[PDB]
Structures are given as C-alpha cells and as structure tokens.
Ligand binder design. Structure first.
Ligand SMILES: *[C@H](O)[C@H](C[C@@H]1CCNC1=O)NC(=O)[C@H](CC(C)C)NC(=O)[C@@H](NC(=O)OCc1ccccc1)[C@@H](C)OC(C)(C)C
Ligand SMILES: *[C@H](O)[C@H](C[C@@H]1CCNC1=O)NC(=O)[C@H](CC(C)C)NC(=O)[C@@H](NC(=O)OCc1ccccc1)[C@@H](C)OC(C)(C)C
Lengths: 306, 306
C-alpha cells in the first residue's frame, strides 16, 4: 500500500552524465556510444544569449575548444555538429557504461524522471510531466542545463528531454534529444510566453483510481455523467477534454476497482464544482495530475527494472 | 528556480540490491563487502508471522537454505547470523560494486531516499521523512521488504532504513541496518498502533523559506511572535515544539532571505489559525513538512554527488 510520486532508478543515466566546457560556460552533456549530446548554447557567452547567430557562433569553434570531462576521465573530441538545438561532439572512446537506449519525443501529459546535474555530477532525481503547454515545472539552477529526462522499460532507457532554459515563470523548457524544442520556445534570452496551461484530466482520473485502491474513497459519489456533460465542465475548469481514447486507457483501472469511468468522471465533477472542503486525497489538498494511468498500474503492480 | 521533492541519485544503491530467498519467501537484501543484510522474517512462512519464535525458527535453517541472487550472478552463503531484526548472510565474494558506505540511525524529522525493489531489482526512488512517531508514509507492495533508505554525502552512502512492515494505516515501519526498529514496533503480524503523529515544525519553516526564495511570498505577514507564544499555538495544531536549536539551524535560511525566524513563525501562526483560503504555496494546498533545512539549502545550492 501507499502512493508516492516515484522516479525511475537513475543508475543507468548517472553513468552517462559528463561535464562539457566551451570558453567559460560549463554544463552537462549526455555521453552515449562515442557521441556527447548537450545544449548548443554551451557555445555562448552571457552577451551572446540576447540574440545568438548559432551557425556563426559555432564556426568560431574547433574540436579542441570543447572540453568534455567524465568524472576525471577525459575525452578527445574528434568531430562536432549542430542538430537543431543540441550539439553532438564525436569523441574518441565509447562510453563503456552506455545502457541500451533510444531517443523518444514524448507527448503532453506523459511523465518522465529528471536527473538534475551540475558540472556533470548528478545531484538528485524527481518525477514530472510534460505539461499540455509543453513546459515542465522542475528544479533547475545555473549549470543544470543539459540534465536529461528519461523513462526506463526494463533494461532500455528512453531519453526524452534535455534541459535548456527557465522561462519568466520559473517553469522550464527543453528539447528532445534530437534538439527540437518541446513547445514554441527558442534558445534565446528574449521574452517568451508559455501560454495557458490546462489540467491533464486523464491523469487526474488515474490518480483518483489510485486513491480508491489505497482505501481513500470519500469522493466516490452517487452520481454518473456523460462524456459530453463532463467535458462541458472540464473546460470551465481549464481541464483537457476527455476522449474515448482516455476512457480506454483507464479501462484496466476501471476493471481492477469495479468503478465505471463515467462514474469517476461524475465524482470528479462535484470535486471541481464543490472543492475538497479542506479534505485530502492521498495526502494532497489539490487534484493531482502528474500520474499517468501507466504510472498508477506500474506502482500497484510492482514493476522492476535493470 | 523551482522546488521539487528530490531523491538522491540511486546508482550507488542499485548495485547493492540482491534477491534473498528462504523456503517460499523471497525479498530484497543489501550486499556490502561479503555480507548480505535483509529482514529476518525472510525465514518465516505466512503462518509463522502471527507469533514467530525467531531464534527457534532460525535454528531449523542452514547456510544452504538461503538463496542469494544478484541479477543472475549468484552467491555462496558461508555464514549466517541474526542481529536484532536483520539477518546477515556471509557470502564468499565481496560486492565489487560496494560504495563507500556507513550505517546510521537517523532521528525523527530527518529525510532520506528510498529505493523500492522487488525480487532484488530496483523499481523506483522517492524521498521521505522519518515521522516523529517513527513511521514513514511510503509506497511498499508485497516483496518490497528489505528495500533500503539512504542519504548520500558526496561519495559516501549512509544507509539508515530497511523496510520490514506495513501497519494497519498503510504507513510503514522498519529498522536501521543494525536491525533495531524505529519506533515501538516488532516484526510480528499482531495489531500495532503507531501513536499520534505530529508535524515537523522546523521542516515547515524551512519549506516556507524555500517558498520565499522561489518568489512565493504572499503569506509573509506584518506580525512577529515569541518562541513561547508560537509554541503555544504549535501544540493545539499538533506541531512539534520549536527549540532554539531549530532556530539556529534555520539561521542560514534566515540570513539568505533577510527574514528573522520569529517573523516566519508568526506568518506560520496565521496560516495555522486561518488556513490558506484555497491558495497554494510552492504548488501545494497543504503545509509541507518533509524538507529539512539542509534539503532546502542543498537544493538552492546545487550540491552534487558521486
Ligand atoms: C543553463 O545551465 C541555464 C539553466 C537555467 C538558469 C538557471 N535555471 C535554469 O533553468 N540556462 C540558460 O542560461 C538558458 C539558455 C537559453 C539558450 C535556453 N537561458 C535561460 O534559462 C534564461 N531563459 C530565458 O531567457 O527565457 C526567455 C526569457 C524569459 C524571461 C525574460 C527574458 C527572456 C534564464 C537565464 O532567464 C531567466 C531565468 C528568465 C533570468
Ligand atoms: C514483506 O515484503 C512485506 C511488505 C509489506 C507487505 C505489503 N506491503 C508491505 O509493506 N512485509 C511483511 O509481510 C511484514 C512482515 C513483518 C515481520 C514485519 N508484515 C507486514 O507488513 C504486515 N504488518 C503487520 O502485520 O503489522 C502489525 C499488524 C497490523 C495490522 C493488523 C495486524 C497486525 C502486513 C502484511 O499486514 C497488513 C499489511 C496489515 C495486512
């Protein structure tokens, strides 16, 4: 029993974090096979950040201007290129600790673990979700740039996020590992609006299922509702519309608890309409939306990795 | 910027989790040097759990009745003993992945990371606190027994917790690595009350400091208060009494933010007396108490490990 926001074990990703330096700027890179991946703004000064011509800036640099350090072991750069907003530094040695990996672009609402690093050394790990407006609400200080987000599927690490910037909100923006930003953001120190965020409705329902499984069932009400009537409530409350796809993925949770999806929708409707009267659900006084239906299944299934 | 409940990177502890089997019962053990540590109730059946005579039960067992598996590598048990509520199995090979480690008994209010495992394979990682009533509110299913809690100080892993049981609350109880329970609990399937829990006041203040650092300052009020007057409010609200020791440890936070400890005490007093009016602090509608003053300093300092 019990429900906790749980991150993947970070061992396989720790053995891939290196420190990349170019000029005075130092940040974290990801070392897989004989390639090091890091934010391309490692090549910028503080002044360059206001309006960088990245192709121009990169031309001034050669292989030896890039210092890659792995702990204290240290790598020879023999090729460099820019893929969108990441740089790829070709080094002379494969990472002997390269896990089975792949690069994936995740979708809004999906969750992932973040290993926050500084100077190429891991600091801590926490779990979060790609918000529908393609930001994440993380914990990132100066030098955490290049820290990565990932999921683990038994032995295979799916890298999905690399940290690039903080916005004027304290929210965070970043790219996949092909260097394509999530969201409309660019890697420039110029005012950028995230846009209206919305609540991940299918994740809220999954959490509400997780609550029922763990004994907390006071919100379980008398009522039911329709998909369209519930959706009509979701949008006054800035919730993402619920589709039949969302119903289907909550199916397993529906059948383990014996509660139809639409009856949970109605319970969630009165919660949106009436508040919590200062009660809590799984130790929270807010409706929690960074658990996917798979995060719930996996936590009350006990799935392991290595 | 940003504030997240962050766990230590689990890499050093992953390389120590093994699977221990005795009879039909299987659980997790911790393999350091040539010794494997695990809950002594691995030696019990389901019926034994109601009232176990552990010394008697252990006499029926020999070295070869204990199957230790590390991934698929596999260990030869050449000695076994019972230290309080842990068994120690002497194996024929040192763990080549033994980190610099030590065993520590932590105090109520301190925090630690938990690596939840099943069958000796890590499943996920999350952070928590030893509640003042010596329970933890974790996420533990059948077979997670023997999963450990730890802190990391640069390169040194301080193991402080091993999971043994769930109580009739869904809260969790366990031992240090010398096998001494935290709390008044015994390893028997007999009704056991945790006792009244209280809120870790010095941790709440630290979080409130963390909030100020991250821009959230609406609760910062006009008032101040005295240690004794605040304490008189803390105990109607089941808060732990605040000592001058607690003031001193909040000192660094006091000086980085320029807010006297007693003025935060008064802000926290009206929060206890008046609620949050449905507002939030660092994305929570509850007063958060599983961040120590060091967890705060370390997260807005960017301390790394390896
Ligand atoms: C790299 O380690 C660092 C990590 C940042 C700094 C502290 N926390 C973080 O997450 N990242 C950068 O320096 C990064 C480089 C860009 C190329 C991606 N820049 C930023 O994070 C800035 N973000 C930014 O300028 O966004 C657009 C903007 C918003 C508001 C006002 C003007 C422009 C940071 C440094 O800017 C702050 C945090 C808004 C001051
Ligand atoms: C070992 O993997 C397993 C882990 C438990 C089970 C699922 N979640 C967990 O945290 N632990 C045990 O089987 C453990 C063995 C004891 C020697 C420590 N026993 C328990 O966790 C039981 N706890 C218990 O009996 O506490 C006293 C008690 C409370 C309430 C009623 C009677 C006795 C569990 C199995 O008992 C439940 C969870 C109360 C059913």
């Amino acid at each position: 029993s019990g429900f906790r926001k749980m991150a993947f074990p970070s061992g396989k990703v720790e053995g891939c974090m290196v420190q990349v330096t170019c000029g005075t700027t130092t940040l974290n890179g990801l070392w897989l096979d004989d390639v090091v991946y890091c934010p391309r703004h490692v090549i910028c000064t503080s002044e360059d950040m206001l309006n960088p011509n990245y192709e121009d800036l990169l031309i001034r640099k050669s292989n030896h201007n890039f210092l890659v350090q792995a702990g204290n072991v240290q790598l020879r750069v023999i090729g460099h290129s820019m893929q969108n907003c990441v740089l790829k530094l070709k080094v002379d040695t494969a990472n002997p600790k390269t896990p089975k990996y792949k690069f994936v672009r995740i979708q809004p609402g999906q969750t992932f673990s973040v290993l926050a690093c500084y100077n190429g050394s891991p600091s801590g790990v926490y779990q979060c979700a790609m918000r529908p407006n393609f930001t994440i609400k993380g914990s990132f200080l100066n030098g955490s740039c290049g820290s990565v987000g990932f999921n683990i599927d038994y032995d295979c690490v799916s890298f999905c996020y690399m940290h690039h910037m903080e916005l004027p909100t304290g929210v965070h923006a970043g790219t996949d590992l092909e260097g394509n930003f999530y969201g409309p953001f660019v890697d420039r120190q110029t005012a950028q609006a995230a846009g209206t965020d919305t609540t991940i409705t299918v994740n809220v329902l999954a959490w509400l299922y997780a609550a029922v499984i763990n004994g907390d069932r006071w919100f379980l009400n008398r009522f039911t509702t329709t998909l369209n009537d519930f959706n009509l409530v979701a949008m006054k409350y800035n919730y993402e519309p619920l589709t039949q796809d969302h119903v289907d993925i909550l199916g397993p949770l529906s059948a383990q608890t014996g509660i139809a999806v639409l009856d949970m929708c109605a319970s969630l409707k009165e919660l949106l309409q009436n508040g919590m009267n200062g009660r809590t659900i799984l130790g929270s006084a807010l409706l929690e939306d960074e658990f996917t239906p798979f995060d719930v299944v996996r936590q009350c299934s006990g799935v392991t990795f290595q």
